[PDB]
Amino acid sequence: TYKIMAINAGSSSLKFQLLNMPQGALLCQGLIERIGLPEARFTLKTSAQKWQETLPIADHHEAVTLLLEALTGRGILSSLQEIDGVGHRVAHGGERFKDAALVCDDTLREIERLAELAPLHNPVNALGIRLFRQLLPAVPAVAVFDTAFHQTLAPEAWLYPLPWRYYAELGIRRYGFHGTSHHYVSSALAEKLGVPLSALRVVSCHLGNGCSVCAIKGGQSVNTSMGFTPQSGVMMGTRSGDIDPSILPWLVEKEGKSAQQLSQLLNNESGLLGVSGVSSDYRDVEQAADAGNERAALALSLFAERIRATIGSYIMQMGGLDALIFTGGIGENSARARAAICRNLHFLGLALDDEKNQRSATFIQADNALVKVAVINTNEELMIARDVMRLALPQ
């Protein structure tokens, strides 16, 4: 067995998991949040216990220090030498990274170069990589990019119909995200079916606060709904997803919106929150909808419709469908959302078993359906730990 730590560094946060590999058992997990802010908090959980303290945490360096000291201070590790590898979530690998990469000087420059494409995430992702290299110098580290799984998209799927120089000189194209989650659940589906992923045409729906759909054919991503940034594609908690682009110049002219306000509009004020007027949380919107709030009911119906439209585009592209996967916090738990998304799909041989769907069984398709419909819990940290093993510990 090996001890692999999965790290996700945010602008003011540090998420971590420590896993026993290859079995994937969780030794501990937690979150340091409001780094640099007042009310900074360090949470740490094992299977048996939870510890939580509000205390000043100036920067990510202090966050990493407190984490490493707690690993031994709580008897989780006898020593930091027990750590065999670290996997780092990186938001954007551009076209440079088609797979996870061993951390090294060139990897770090590339990730910082790509800050131009993810300004709020890639720099702190790299800071985390640097802090662990500094504080755990002897532990190999692997960068795992949320974009890499989608680097197999063909040009007619990633080119936008803008003038060519917007791609050629400015890098504007569809990248796609949730790559680690779509890779994880699609591989898990094939393992559960006992067939190679390459034999299946798969549509994968990651439905959480962020939401994305991915088409997987021949074992490779061939399309996915987020585009240039994680703002686009289907409707989400606060993100609009795709809208008529000509709305934005209209709003700049009418309301004088700045670029920053336009992004805030598209990313923080839209989606379930903007339509329902209630909440970004699917459960909250559903609760209001069942009590008669018509905007909330419309929010939920539009949410399912946008996902259905995207599934339909990708079934068309692949020439049919063998399996549909639901994952994420909504896809895993909402029998009602899955039922609305899957309704009236007899032209595909796709129908649900209501009893299986109601209990979120692993497979929820009807007895005589031609399409497998799976509810699979996504585990991005396990996926990252597997990439660490593959690239840092081939032995």
Place this chain on the structure above:
Amino acid sequence: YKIMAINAGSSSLKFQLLNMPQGALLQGLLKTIDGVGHRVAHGGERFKDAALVCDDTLREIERLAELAPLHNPVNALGIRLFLLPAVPAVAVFDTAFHQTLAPEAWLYPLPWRYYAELGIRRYGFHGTSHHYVSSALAEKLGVPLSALRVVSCHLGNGCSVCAIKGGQSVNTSMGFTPQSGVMMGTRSGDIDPSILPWLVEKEGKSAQQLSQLLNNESGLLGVSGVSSDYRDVEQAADAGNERAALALSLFAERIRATIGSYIMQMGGLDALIFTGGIGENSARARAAICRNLHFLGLALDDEKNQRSATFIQADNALVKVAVINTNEELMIARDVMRLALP
């Protein structure tokens, strides 16, 4: 009867006089009067159908210039000129056919007030074309249009797709303005909306420049670097221009993605219609759009497609695939007949 179809472009004036009912032509800005029909670009939510031209109609139109400020004004001007005070007139709106869309199809996932206070929503256009060719299809097949699940592709310099189920438009690809949906001659269609704030920040684009980018510099012209005209791009791709070949592949991909959404929404497909300058004449575009669709029972017959036959699906195919020449002036004249000489 003699019906006059009028299209008042902001510096032009297309005209057609037809022998109704059978629609024989008597063409204009001249080739070889019971009522006049006026093309109107935007009917908002107010007009679900063509309307008799009266005072009420005319200032409802001129109010909607708040949404179509560069077209509705001189459309209503052309109406007011017709100076022809004894001839009944009817306004035919490019948006009206799509007023049967349900909220799930026309509401954007924006803050609610953008719809509720500013009227921002999907309207859709090419309504008279989609209405015309879908009705003609049902007539050719000899069944009610309400019996068919139809996807209609109007492919010309402007391009749009429309899903028709139960005899009504249930979705269409152009949105708030005619800029959006699929890739076109110079219009980009739908793109990742987050690109635009990025461009404002990185290149200092004004709203005007963003509009010019989306409407005049993108599409076939922007991708190919050759032309906004499909045939010109095709010539260059045939000669080895890689961008031109990519432009044509992306053009078909965008239409296919949209067709797939609409098939999903309708729960299947009975017929696909191609119309417009590209749809009526390009065997290549139709074949690339219809590739590898056996899961729907849709395949093309190469000999029929090559000569643009009225029906081009393979004889073993379940889905009818039709090539129908659109005739919006005839459609307008039929609207005049129905509302002004009933």
